[PDB]
Structures are given as structure tokens and as C-alpha cells.
Design an enzyme around this catalytic site. Structure first.
Site, mmCIF file in Angstrom:
data_model
loop_
_atom_site.group_PDB
_atom_site.id
_atom_site.type_symbol
_atom_site.label_atom_id
_atom_site.label_comp_id
_atom_site.label_asym_id
_atom_site.label_seq_id
_atom_site.Cartn_x
_atom_site.Cartn_y
_atom_site.Cartn_z
ATOM 1 N N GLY A 26 -28.643 17.168 63.802
ATOM 2 C CA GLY A 26 -27.683 17.030 64.882
ATOM 3 C C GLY A 26 -26.261 17.443 64.547
ATOM 4 O O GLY A 26 -25.320 17.017 65.214
ATOM 5 N N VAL A 32 -25.584 24.447 59.327
ATOM 6 C CA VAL A 32 -26.865 24.578 58.650
ATOM 7 C C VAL A 32 -27.964 24.440 59.687
ATOM 8 O O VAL A 32 -28.046 23.430 60.381
ATOM 9 C CB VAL A 32 -27.046 23.503 57.571
ATOM 10 C CG1 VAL A 32 -28.403 23.678 56.900
ATOM 11 C CG2 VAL A 32 -25.921 23.608 56.542
ATOM 12 N N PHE A 93 -36.877 23.165 52.898
ATOM 13 C CA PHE A 93 -36.550 22.110 53.849
ATOM 14 C C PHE A 93 -37.257 20.863 53.328
ATOM 15 O O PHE A 93 -38.459 20.894 53.064
ATOM 16 C CB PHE A 93 -37.079 22.463 55.247
ATOM 17 C CG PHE A 93 -36.794 21.415 56.289
ATOM 18 C CD1 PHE A 93 -35.519 21.279 56.830
ATOM 19 C CD2 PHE A 93 -37.795 20.547 56.714
ATOM 20 C CE1 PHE A 93 -35.244 20.291 57.781
ATOM 21 C CE2 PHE A 93 -37.530 19.557 57.663
ATOM 22 C CZ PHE A 93 -36.252 19.429 58.195
ATOM 23 N N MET A 94 -36.517 19.771 53.166
ATOM 24 C CA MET A 94 -37.112 18.535 52.669
ATOM 25 C C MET A 94 -37.457 17.634 53.846
ATOM 26 O O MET A 94 -36.574 17.145 54.554
ATOM 27 C CB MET A 94 -36.146 17.833 51.720
ATOM 28 C CG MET A 94 -35.731 18.685 50.529
ATOM 29 S SD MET A 94 -37.046 18.895 49.323
ATOM 30 C CE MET A 94 -37.069 17.254 48.580
ATOM 31 N N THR A 95 -38.755 17.418 54.031
ATOM 32 C CA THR A 95 -39.291 16.621 55.128
ATOM 33 C C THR A 95 -38.559 15.360 55.575
ATOM 34 O O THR A 95 -38.327 15.186 56.768
ATOM 35 C CB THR A 95 -40.768 16.241 54.853
ATOM 36 O OG1 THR A 95 -41.544 17.438 54.735
ATOM 37 C CG2 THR A 95 -41.337 15.403 56.000
ATOM 38 N N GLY A 97 -35.360 14.317 54.930
ATOM 39 C CA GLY A 97 -33.909 14.334 54.991
ATOM 40 C C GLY A 97 -33.144 13.771 53.812
ATOM 41 O O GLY A 97 -33.673 13.650 52.703
ATOM 42 N N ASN A 98 -31.886 13.414 54.057
ATOM 43 C CA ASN A 98 -31.022 12.904 52.997
ATOM 44 C C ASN A 98 -31.396 11.498 52.550
ATOM 45 O O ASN A 98 -31.854 10.682 53.347
ATOM 46 C CB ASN A 98 -29.548 12.979 53.434
ATOM 47 C CG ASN A 98 -29.151 11.864 54.385
ATOM 48 O OD1 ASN A 98 -28.899 10.739 53.963
ATOM 49 N ND2 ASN A 98 -29.090 12.175 55.673
ATOM 50 N N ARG A 143 -25.895 10.566 49.800
ATOM 51 C CA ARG A 143 -25.784 11.471 50.946
ATOM 52 C C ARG A 143 -26.016 12.939 50.564
ATOM 53 O O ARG A 143 -26.326 13.769 51.422
ATOM 54 C CB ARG A 143 -24.401 11.329 51.594
ATOM 55 C CG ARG A 143 -23.265 11.637 50.634
ATOM 56 C CD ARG A 143 -21.882 11.459 51.262
ATOM 57 N NE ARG A 143 -20.872 11.673 50.231
ATOM 58 C CZ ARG A 143 -20.370 10.714 49.463
ATOM 59 N NH1 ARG A 143 -20.765 9.456 49.619
ATOM 60 N NH2 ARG A 143 -19.514 11.022 48.498
ATOM 61 N N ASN A 144 -25.854 13.261 49.285
ATOM 62 C CA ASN A 144 -26.068 14.628 48.821
ATOM 63 C C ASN A 144 -27.456 14.830 48.197
ATOM 64 O O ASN A 144 -27.699 15.825 47.513
ATOM 65 C CB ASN A 144 -24.978 15.035 47.825
ATOM 66 C CG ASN A 144 -23.784 15.685 48.506
ATOM 67 O OD1 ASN A 144 -23.924 16.361 49.520
ATOM 68 N ND2 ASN A 144 -22.607 15.487 47.943
HETATM 69 C C1 LIG Z 1 -29.149 25.689 53.278
HETATM 70 C C2 LIG Z 1 -28.508 25.243 51.943
HETATM 71 C C3 LIG Z 1 -27.486 26.069 51.366
HETATM 72 C C4 LIG Z 1 -26.860 25.702 50.120
HETATM 73 C C5 LIG Z 1 -27.235 24.516 49.424
HETATM 74 N N1 LIG Z 1 -26.571 24.220 48.179
HETATM 75 C C6 LIG Z 1 -26.778 23.139 47.339
HETATM 76 O O1 LIG Z 1 -27.421 22.144 47.639
HETATM 77 C C7 LIG Z 1 -26.173 23.160 45.972
HETATM 78 C C8 LIG Z 1 -26.613 22.227 44.932
HETATM 79 C C9 LIG Z 1 -26.000 22.257 43.627
HETATM 80 C C10 LIG Z 1 -24.940 23.225 43.356
HETATM 81 C C11 LIG Z 1 -24.216 23.314 42.000
HETATM 82 N N2 LIG Z 1 -22.723 23.324 42.021
HETATM 83 C C12 LIG Z 1 -22.128 23.390 40.612
HETATM 84 C C13 LIG Z 1 -20.566 23.422 40.654
HETATM 85 N N3 LIG Z 1 -20.053 22.189 41.401
HETATM 86 C C14 LIG Z 1 -18.583 22.187 41.392
HETATM 87 C C15 LIG Z 1 -20.641 22.115 42.803
HETATM 88 C C16 LIG Z 1 -22.195 22.113 42.751
HETATM 89 C C17 LIG Z 1 -24.527 24.142 44.405
HETATM 90 C C18 LIG Z 1 -25.124 24.115 45.685
HETATM 91 C C19 LIG Z 1 -28.269 23.673 50.005
HETATM 92 C C20 LIG Z 1 -28.894 24.019 51.230
HETATM 93 N N4 LIG Z 1 -29.881 23.173 51.743
HETATM 94 C C21 LIG Z 1 -29.575 22.234 52.715
HETATM 95 N N5 LIG Z 1 -28.293 22.084 53.212
HETATM 96 C C22 LIG Z 1 -28.012 21.150 54.185
HETATM 97 C C23 LIG Z 1 -29.040 20.326 54.695
HETATM 98 C C24 LIG Z 1 -30.358 20.509 54.159
HETATM 99 C C25 LIG Z 1 -31.550 19.717 54.598
HETATM 100 C C26 LIG Z 1 -31.450 18.548 55.463
HETATM 101 C C27 LIG Z 1 -32.632 17.818 55.858
HETATM 102 C C28 LIG Z 1 -33.909 18.274 55.375
HETATM 103 N N6 LIG Z 1 -33.994 19.402 54.545
HETATM 104 C C29 LIG Z 1 -32.873 20.125 54.149
HETATM 105 N N7 LIG Z 1 -30.574 21.459 53.185
HETATM 106 CL CL LIG Z 2 -31.051 14.845 56.980
HETATM 107 CL CL LIG Z 3 -40.829 18.299 51.490
#
Ligand SMILES: Cc1ccc(NC(=O)c2ccc(CN3CCN(C)CC3)cc2)cc1Nc1nccc(-c2cccnc2)n1
Ligand SMILES: [Cl-]
Ligand SMILES: [Cl-]
Ligand SMILES: [Cl-]
Ligand SMILES: [Cl-]
Length: 274
Positions: A26, A32, A93-95, A97-98, A143-144
Site C-alpha cells: 500500500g 516499489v 518477493f518474500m511471501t 512481508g516485513n 522493519r528492514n
Molecule cells: C526491490 C528492492 C530493491 C533494492 C533492495 N535493496 C536492499 O534490500 C539492500 C540490502 C542491503 C544493502 C547493503 N548496503 C551496504 C551499505 N549500507 C550503508 C547500506 C546497505 C543494500 C540494499 C531491496 C528490494 N526489495 C524489496 N524492497 C521493498 C519491499 C520489498 C518486499 C516487501 C514485501 C514482500 N517482499 C518484498 N522488497
Molecule cells: Cl511488507
Molecule cells: Cl518467500
């Protein structure tokens, strides 16, 4: 693209291969979207860039960073579309969510103590890997994190700074920081290291042990530092094993050099979980 081309990048993919859908969660994650990688009937998450915004430099840097890391407990990069706008970064995509909302909405009979311990173990593994690669997270919190099937947990970084509308992140010289997850040295000297990530991990363990409760409940942000300096720390959550709480306090040592490394934290959890 072209294998013989001087600018060949195995990660660049065909924008047309993905069926774009609605915004994910939402809108909580920002620009994203949920997508379908046709060629594999796979549902994916696609981060994109607003209508030509002054953040291309940062976006591309994220993409480059993600191409450098791989681990079973770190969200997996599947491909990018940073050849021509609109730029794309595609991950799995993680089924479920967060993690934050998952913990608050789960069947506590299913997500028992052993499962919580299991989730903390997966997270420490991912961080141990980032530590090994000399990478720094900077915003580790429930949350991350994402939850998959069979309680699979993966660490991510959604760049929630300006997305969150709550009191989680607060202003500071044109930037926002989650005060209750930030190490003292980070609040005071703007010094971020893998040690401040360890402190944040400590808070995360607390979030996990409380099934998603907010840190330092009731305490206003402006007095958190002083209290931490006065040696105040969050109490052991109800039902939280002594060993896990002991781990929490070690992550919350005022001096970063005194905090355990993720290698030690993970090694500890393995022993425990078994
Ligand atoms: C679409 C996408 C684009 C980029 C990323 N990036 C990251 O997740 C990530 C993780 C670790 C690092 C490492 N980095 C090292 C340096 N320091 C300073 C910052 C972190 C960078 C990016 C994730 C996604 N995935 C994503 N994003 C938002 C929501 C969801 C999502 C929500 C619900 C179910 N499934 C997926 N999934
Ligand atoms: Cl989510
Ligand atoms: Cl999954
Ligand atoms: Cl290659
Ligand atoms: Cl880094």
C-alpha cells in the site's frame, strides 16, 4: 545484453520481461512495485525511480552494492534495468512481508521461542557476512527485514529514512535517523561502523523478543542519549531467555570496541538454537 560488448553486465535484464503491477505494501516502501517475471511466472519486487529525480546517483550506487553481496539471509538481487530510465532493481518477493508487522500479526503458538531464536540466528548470520565483507548496514531493524516460508528471514535495506511518516526517524542536519536504534557514538559523533550495527542488532533482538514492541516505550527521544550515558538500558522482555538478554547487553556496551563481533554473536546463537 551483448556478451562481447565492452559494457556487458550480467545483471541487466529486459524491462519487458517483467509485468508491473500495484505498489507494494500500500505504499509503505515507496516506489516499489509487485511484478511478475513472466519467463518464470515468478512474483518479484521492483524498486524504481520517481519521474526523473535527483537521486539517480544514489540509486545506481545501491544497485552496484547489491551486485557485490550474496547470502541466504540477505534479500536476493535478481536483476536490474539501469541502462535506460525508468531504472529498475529487481529482487525476490518474500511471501510474508516485513518482520516488524509479521511479529505483531503472527500466531504466537506457531512463532514460539525456538522460532524467535531461529529468526535472530538467521539475522546474525547475514550480518556476520556483511562484517566479513567490511560492509556496514546503517539501519538494521525489524522493519528492514523480510519473512519468507518456513520462517526464513532475510535482511534488507528499504531506505525508509524519508518514507516513514511516524516518529521512528527524526530529523538531523537534513537527514533522518531512528534514534532508538542508533548507537551513542553515532548520535554524538556521526560515526557509523559495524559496531553501531551491533548495537542496532541488540535493539532488534528486543523487538523480536517482544513480538514487535516499540523500543524504550514512553521515553521521549530527546532524553534517550543521556539515559544511555547514565547507563540505562531496556529491561529483559518477559519470556526472554537469560542467555539472549545477556547478548543484548553486550551489544549495548557504551564503548563500541567492547561490543561482540557478529562472528561471536552468531556463534553464540548456533550453540543456543541447538
Ligand atoms: C526491490 C528492492 C530493491 C533494492 C533492495 N535493496 C536492499 O534490500 C539492500 C540490502 C542491503 C544493502 C547493503 N548496503 C551496504 C551499505 N549500507 C550503508 C547500506 C546497505 C543494500 C540494499 C531491496 C528490494 N526489495 C524489496 N524492497 C521493498 C519491499 C520489498 C518486499 C516487501 C514485501 C514482500 N517482499 C518484498 N522488497
Ligand atoms: Cl511488507
Ligand atoms: Cl518467500
Ligand atoms: Cl559476466
Ligand atoms: Cl558500507
Amino acid at each position: 545484453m551483448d556478451p562481447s560488448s565492452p559494457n556487458y553486465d550480467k545483471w541487466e535484464m529486459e524491462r519487458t520481461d517483467i509485468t508491473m503491477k500495484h505498489k507494494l505494501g500500500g505504499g509503505q516502501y515507496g516506489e516499489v512495485y509487485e511484478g511478475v517475471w513472466k519467463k518464470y511466472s515468478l512474483t518479484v519486487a521492483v524498486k524504481t525511480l520517481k519521474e526523473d529525480t535527483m537521486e539517480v546517483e544514489e540509486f545506481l550506487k545501491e544497485a552496484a552494492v547489491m551486485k557485490e553481496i550474496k547470502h541466504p539471509n540477505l534479500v536476493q538481487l535478481l536483476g536490474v534495468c539501469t541502462r535506460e530510465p525508468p531504472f529498475y532493481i529487481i529482487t525476490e518477493f518474500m511471501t510474508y512481508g516485513n518482520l516488524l508487522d509479521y511479529l505483531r500479526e503472527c500466531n504466537r503458538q506457531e512463532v514460539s521461542a525456538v522460532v524467535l531464536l531461529y529468526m535472530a540466528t538467521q539475522i546474525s548470520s547475514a550480518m556476520e557476512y556483511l562484517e566479513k565483507k567490511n560492509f556496514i548496514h546503517r539501519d538494521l531493524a525489524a522493519r528492514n527485514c523480510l519473512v519468507g516460508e518456513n520462517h526464513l528471514v532475510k535482511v534488507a535495506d528499504f531506505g525508509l529514512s524519508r518514507l516513514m511518516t511516524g516518529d521512528t526517524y527524526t530529523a538531523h542536519a537534513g537527514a533522518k535517523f531512528p534514534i532508538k536504534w542508533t548507537a551513542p557514538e553515532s548520535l554524538a559523533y556521526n560515526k557509523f561502523s559495524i559496531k553501531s550495527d551491533v548495537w542496532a542488532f541488540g535493539v532488534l533482538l528486543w523487538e523480536i523478543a517482544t513480538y514487535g514492541m516499540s523500543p524504550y516505550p514512553g521515553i521521549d527521544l530527546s532524553q534517550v542519549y543521556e539515559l544511555l550515558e547514565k547507563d540505562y538500558r531496556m529491561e529483559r522482555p518477559e519470556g526472554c531467555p537469560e542467555k539472549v538478554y545477556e547478548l543484548m547487553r553486550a551489544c549495548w556496551q557504551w564503548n563500541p570496541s567492547d561490543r561482540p563481533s557478529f562472528a561471536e554473536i552468531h556463534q553464540a546463537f548456533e550453540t543456543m538454537f541447538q
